[PDB]
Amino acid sequence: SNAPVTELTRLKEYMEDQIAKAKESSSLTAQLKFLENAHTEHFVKMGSLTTIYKGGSEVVDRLKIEIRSLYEEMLELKDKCRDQIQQYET
């Protein structure tokens, strides 16, 4: 399989791209799809990192911290989108 540094580097770029497009977009449907793209890729890549990474790598550990920061920001944007959906429904 690919190296942990390779997977997390590509995951970082993917999540940054999707989160950027969600913040740029003024369409709630597009925002939900952008956040869904990032959420799915994060779940797959992070859940499989156990298989290829054992720990002890400063770059991989630093990438994990930066990915978690992207993940946390992704969760706020999903909460903001959910807030807007609830407004429409009420």
Side-chain angles (χ1 to χ4, degrees):
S1 300
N2 296 321
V5 57
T6 301
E7 289 298 309
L8 297 192
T9 294
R10 292 168 183 176
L11 176 59
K12 191 177 160 190
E13 167 201 35
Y14 186 79
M15 295 184 68
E16 282 176 346
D17 183 47
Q18 296 298 311
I19 287 162
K21 298 163 160 199
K23 293 195 291 197
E24 191 254 30
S25 182
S26 64
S27 160
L28 182 68
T29 48
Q31 287 177 327
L32 288 166
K33 185 56 66 173
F34 291 139
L35 299 165
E36 180 188 86
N37 297 338
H39 168 83
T40 302
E41 186 81 346
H42 174 270
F43 193 93
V44 179
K45 295 299 175 178
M46 291 308 300
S48 67
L49 189 75
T50 66
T51 63
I52 56 164
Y53 184 58
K54 298 152 186 82
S57 175
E58 192 72 45
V59 163
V60 179
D61 288 354
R62 177 55 48 187
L63 282 165
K64 284 174 75 179
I65 294 162
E66 290 163 349
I67 283 161
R68 186 183 41 185
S69 288
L70 267 15
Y71 177 66
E72 288 165 1
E73 180 185 12
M74 188 199 74
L75 290 183
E76 285 181 309
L77 293 169
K78 291 171 99 296
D79 279 326
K80 293 283 266 173
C81 290
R82 191 180 172 277
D83 289 347
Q84 188 56 258
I85 297 160
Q86 298 269 22
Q87 280 189 273
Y88 283 129
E89 295 198 78
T90 59

